[PDB]
Design a protein around this nucleic acid. Structure first.
Ligand SMILES: C[C@H](CCC(=O)NCCC[N+](C)(C)C[C@H](O)CS(=O)(=O)O)[C@H]1CC[C@H]2[C@@H]3[C@H](O)C[C@@H]4C[C@H](O)CC[C@]4(C)[C@H]3C[C@H](O)[C@]12C
Ligand SMILES: C[C@H](CCC(=O)NCCC[N+](C)(C)C[C@H](O)CS(=O)(=O)O)[C@H]1CC[C@H]2[C@@H]3[C@H](O)C[C@@H]4C[C@H](O)CC[C@]4(C)[C@H]3C[C@H](O)[C@]12C
Ligand code: 118
Ligand code: 118
Lengths: 268, 268
DNA sequence: GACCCTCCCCTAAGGGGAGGGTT
DNA sequence: AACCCTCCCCTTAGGGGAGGGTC
């Protein structure tokens, strides 16, 4: 049976049989040495049946050329099973995220904020945890606190990129008397000085929202990220970080201040 | 911010930034004309965050270009949601099939029947539906039909490849009172003289196993296909077909015979 | 007329490397 | 040596077509 008749038997393309014969899977029974014509037999039809049965299970071709010659191999099936379970767990997540995106675009005409998961590696920061009356005074109190460290610690150098951020160790919404902790990543351990300490901030997976604008409207970003966490079946693991990428130190216009909200989060 | 600093800010590879600059997804704020060095800006990070937020939902790159360049594109998000649900159905199907495959392979070292889900197109057949006293006697009455149809309808040409099957119209198991119908795909219509009639058989999606060996062991393949149907949550929609690939007409060896059992099913 | 072969380029989203540049 | 660039080839499972030959 020539390649066309066999390709009509299996309901498959001739190019598929060519590719298979090239890769070594499903080699034909008789190759005409004069013109190269590939002739097939029903013994090849029964082989293509199991080839298609494995292909319908998601196995890649190099997995099939192992499954069909190394007959005892069973770990390559449990591996694909765990892979399928991971794919389902990711696809359901993506479906919930798309549903949330659609709900938000229906409610508001514009996707002002856009959540995105990212992996934040651990870093050595110098930290000062204290109580502030409000956010405005906290912004004023940060730079002298940084100056104290960079003066009293020779050889201390900031990290590139400059990961400078704050943590909010409250559990409920506190407009005032906020137990904020300011941190700034350093290349290595420095010595403690007074109330300012050093520590390692653990590596986290976090959903992130960048907020372009003034600081007095970060409540919108926090409300959006909390809605995202509650909706998509996630759980806030740790205190929410807030990363200062751009601000009064780098730009003079308040409308171009760029800050990134980070929610350390884990899935339930 | 140079490309090396930006790749660490974004926590992505450099070649990703090169690809996004080449396709036009993320273009640097300023490219040095002589060297070619790409330089980035906070407003490029604000856009890479959008790129990542959309790519974590599984959007293709061109869909991301269409989404960030053209607003009011909620039809593309709906398309992606429908495709996500389709992929979730297919992944759950794959998971159930590989669970069944593991349940059988870790039970018995050899796989006797692989199961493949293939779509059979519609065809024109001549058929004789009659009660057969036994399956052993069933094979005997077929060549009479085969001669009679070619004698009554001259020039009637069978299709290629030959689709010759049996329709087991019994909704319950029995040995001696089998209500079966022998069908054979033919190119064009003919006369319906006698109990042999012409008809079309609707196109079906069917799970199929290929049975190699004599016709007494077919109950094994039928029980296996029923077990597959019950395990994988399919529903048997129509009467099972039995496609005779190889038989007494091509090969004298009874262990070289081949036959394909087809179960018309739908996913419910 | 139909059918079949090899050879070449293409997919999506980058990965890896070679060779050249500059401070 | 540290970064940077462009250019070329590579990944899947085959698709599409050109040019040439065969039944
Ligand atoms: C959702 C989150 C808790 C999550 C558990 C609550 C608990 C503490 C709250 C922040 C603090 O109050 C400081 C500050 C007050 C401003 O008014 C609005 C912004 C800030 C950052 C607040 C945002 C948000 O409301 C926080 C993070
Ligand atoms: C599952 C299916 C109904 C759904 C039942 C109902 C009728 C049953 C067939 C007939 O009995 C004929 C024959 C008997 C042999 O002994 C075993 C094979 C055959 C083909 C049987 C297979 C299977 O058992 C059938 C298809
Ligand atoms: C030590 C402590 C704080 C700051 Sb900064 C800053 C600088 C670079 C990158 C990120 C943050 C600052 C403020 C004024 C002038 C110069 C630098 C800072 C400001 C507000 C909130 C958080 C951090 C700097 C050093
Ligand atoms: C018309 C009807 C049936 C068959 Sb045959 C067959 C052919 C030659 C010699 C003996 C038998 C068949 C099928 C099932 C049971 C008994 C006979 C047949 C079927 C498929 C492919 C090729 C031949 C052929 C023409």
């Amino acid at each position: 049976s020539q390649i066309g008749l066999f390709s009509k038997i299996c309901r498959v393309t001739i190019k598929t049989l060519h590719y298979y014969n090239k890769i070594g899977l499903l080699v034909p029974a008789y190759i005409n040495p004069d013109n190269g014509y590939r002739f097939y037999t029903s013994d090849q039809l029964m082989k293509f049946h199991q080839i298609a049965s494995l292909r319908q299970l998601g196995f890649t071709i190099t997995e099939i050329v192992t499954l069909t010659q190394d007959e005892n191999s069973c770990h390559i099936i449990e591996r694909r099973r765990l892979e399928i379970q991971k794919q389902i767990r990711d696809m359901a997540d993506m479906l919930s995220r798309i549903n949330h995106y659609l709900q938000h675009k229906k409610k508001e005409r514009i996707m002002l904020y856009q959540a995105a998961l990212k992996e934040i590696p651990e870093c050595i920061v110098y930290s000062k945890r204290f109580i502030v009356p409000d956010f405005s005074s906290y912004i004023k109190l940060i730079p002298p606190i940084g100056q104290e460290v960079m003066k009293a610690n020779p050889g201390l150098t900031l990290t590139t990129p400059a990961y400078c951020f704050t943590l909010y160790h409250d559990k409920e919404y506190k407009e005032k008397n906020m137990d904020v902790e300011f941190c700034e990543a350093v290349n290595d351990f420095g010595k403690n000085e007074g109330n300012i300490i050093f520590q390692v901030i653990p590596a986290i997976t976090a959903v992130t929202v960048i907020h372009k604008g003034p600081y007095d409207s970060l409540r919108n970003a926090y409300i959006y990220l909390m809605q995202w966490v509650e909706d998509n079946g996630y759980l806030l693991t740790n205190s929410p970080r807030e990363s200062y990428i751009d601000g009064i130190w780098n730009k003079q216009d308040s409308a171009e201040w760029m800050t990134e909200i980070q929610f350390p989060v884990e899935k339930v």
